[PDB]
Amino acid sequence: DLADRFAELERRYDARLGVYVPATGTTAAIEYRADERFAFCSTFKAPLVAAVLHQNPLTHLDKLITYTSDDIRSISPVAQQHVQTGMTIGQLCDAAIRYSDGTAANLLLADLGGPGGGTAAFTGYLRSLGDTVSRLDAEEPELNRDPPGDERDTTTPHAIALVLQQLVLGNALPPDKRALLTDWMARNTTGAKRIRAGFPADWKVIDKTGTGDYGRANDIAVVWSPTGVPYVVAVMSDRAGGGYDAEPREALLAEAATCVAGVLA
């Protein structure tokens, strides 16, 4: 039984686990704690990029954004190198998704604009996709630090799966913008030990991870079977029992994904 397997992993990693996979033609939805709130952490960056793509002409990607030393306030493997020269909107989207660059996300939020430094417009974007659950309240690095239980900066496995489904498989974006988002997630560098680790090599996986305090570890993916059948997989976790400095455990997500892959085969 799937629920028993998920509960077992929770005991193994002293963690809370959330899983959602939307129903398809012939598969029932897979759900474990799927409507419980979990922190977005960096997973919001996938719909953030979609919002920015949607909001602008495609050549907005070529606009150069400048920024300063006091803009580097979180893990930013890419942006840390380019405060001098700036970064284009395209480069920022690339960094935000593929390297989970936090400064890039802050700059993209600022680009989207409006109250809360873009957090309000980001949330508005999700509402336009029918997501009445998720909310973004802060930018990097605060958004990763809300106490366990707090609703600030949270989504649910169910909500984020439905959003991602519209983004990648559905019609939320035009084909050219949709391809841009998909390619970046396809070329993600941060996800090898998560959902990717649970699916066989002949399955295609694109994804965006999230990591944070209180042992938070998330992964949202779209996967394709060797015959081109797509599934959306959202896995989220925290380890509140360990407190603020609790280590995230990627293995938990790899194991969860392995269980899901067994069903989807």
Ligand SMILES: *C(=O)[C@@H]([C@@H]1NC(C(=O)O)=C(SC2CN(C3=NCCS3)C2)[C@@H]1C)[C@@H](C)O
């Ligand atoms: C978002 O959750 C934070 C950001 N997100 C990100 C992640 O894992 O998703 C980490 S960066 C990172 C460095 N890294 C591994 N190095 C070898 C392969 S992957 C993942 C970080 C916490 C936030 C800063 O935006």
